[PDB]
Design a protein around this ligand. Structure first.
Ligand SMILES: [K+]
Lengths: 245, 245
């Protein structure tokens, strides 16, 4: 895998003349500074404050190399996990890997990181993944609403039907809202399945009939009969016959 | 962004003769068996049991196609993710995404998932990433020892120096261990840097003198002088003059 300390490693692989200079500077420093500042790679052998200087230089290098994930992975070593998550979020660089580490700072920090990751995924055109993350933090209704408002009706219903009681109004509204849109666009057969899902079978027969063809009228008539809307069934059946003349 | 329910989506986009049969089967099923079983795509519109059958089928399709991350989301939707985490650990198929969602099953399930994930990452020879996840559950000594025992001395030292007190014996052993290996391999100048890190300047001078050339003997003598080991410095400085004859 890729090294998290490439600049300092490269500095440590220089000529013996540079290594000899390093030993002297290092011996001087450990024996109770501009030399040390120049030779930042000595942070590995000096003190924590010079180590952190070295790490910050390597982190800057990872950003200038288009590798923000290594920057964040490296800053985790220094310990400010919340600070790492804050700047990762501000930069739109949250990842599953960083969210997976968020519970080290407490449940509350993970909650915030999951929600921030979900916002970021919406901006990255990954609504379904974002909804799944909202589910992980028990925000079932928010996940459903996110998918509904972005026209992922299929997935919203699946989640809603999996987690809510069958009679929950949110579930019924998903069926109706999807059916409505389908009807407007002319997908009458699919809209009818939707209204059936919402336990509005009368409207389901009607919408199938809006197509106007004989096949749709027949099935609409037979649908009404199954449900006990015999009067509607008779009228649709008569319309079916009229279309075949 | 692959769709999570492609098989049932395809079934829902067949000929409208097929969708008309869908409507009749669906109307019958909600107004209350073989058609119910055959047309599993109706699970989105029927009841939870049929929905779960449908989701299981879709997940099976994801696993065979090589998209287990889509199967993981479907299982989440089901709410058995916690069971699916146990199966992933047994098979060593955990992912960053699964750990990021694990706290949904409880804080200690995440703790267990991180430990299983780090164990898996070691088998996949991703030792530095494994150490990062051990840090996330505050197992610093374990992370440092893992890196050391797999010869990631540089990373081991950086993490230990960042998290442990300067006088922690673990940090000293790291320098001495790395220096020991470097010396055995003939990298005397690097080993001397490690011995300086462990506050063993006397041994640093000596090891740097093992190279034998005038430059190494010289810098070693100057190193002993900087530390106040002037007796050693004189000995090495005169060995340097003998070499320059
Ligand atoms: K909890």
């Amino acid at each position: 895998a890729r090294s998290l300390l490439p600049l300092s490693t490269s500095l440590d692989h220089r000529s013996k003349e540079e290594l000899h200079q390093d030993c002297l500077v290092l011996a001087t420093a450990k024996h109770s500074s501009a030399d040390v500042e120049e030779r930042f790679h000595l942070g590995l052998f000096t003190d924590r404050a010079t180590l952190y200087r070295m790490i910050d230089i390597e982190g800057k290098g990872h950003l200038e190399n288009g590798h923000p994930e290594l920057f964040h992975q490296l800053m985790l070593w220094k310990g400010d996990l919340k600070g790492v998550l804050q700047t990762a979020a501000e930069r739109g660089e949250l990842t599953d890997n960083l969210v997976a580490m968020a519970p080290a700072a407490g449940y509350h920090v993970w909650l915030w990181a999951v929600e921030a990751f979900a916002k970021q995924l919406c901006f990255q055109d990954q609504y379904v993944k974002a909804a799944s993350h909202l589910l992980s933090i028990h925000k079932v209704y928010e996940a459903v609403e996110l998918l509904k408002s972005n026209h992922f009706y299929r997935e919203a219903i699946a989640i809603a039907k999996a987690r809510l009681r069958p009679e929950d109004p949110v579930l019924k509204d998903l069926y109706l809202s999807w059916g409505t849109v389908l009807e407007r666009d002319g997908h009458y057969a699919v809209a009818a399945k939707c209204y059936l899902g919402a336990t509005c079978a009368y409207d389901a027969a009607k919408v199938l009939a809006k197509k106007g063809d004989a096949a749709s009228l027949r099935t609409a008539a037979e649908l009404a009969a199954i449900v006990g809307e015999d009067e509607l069934s008779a009228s649709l059946a008569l319309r079916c016959a009229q279309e075949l003349l």
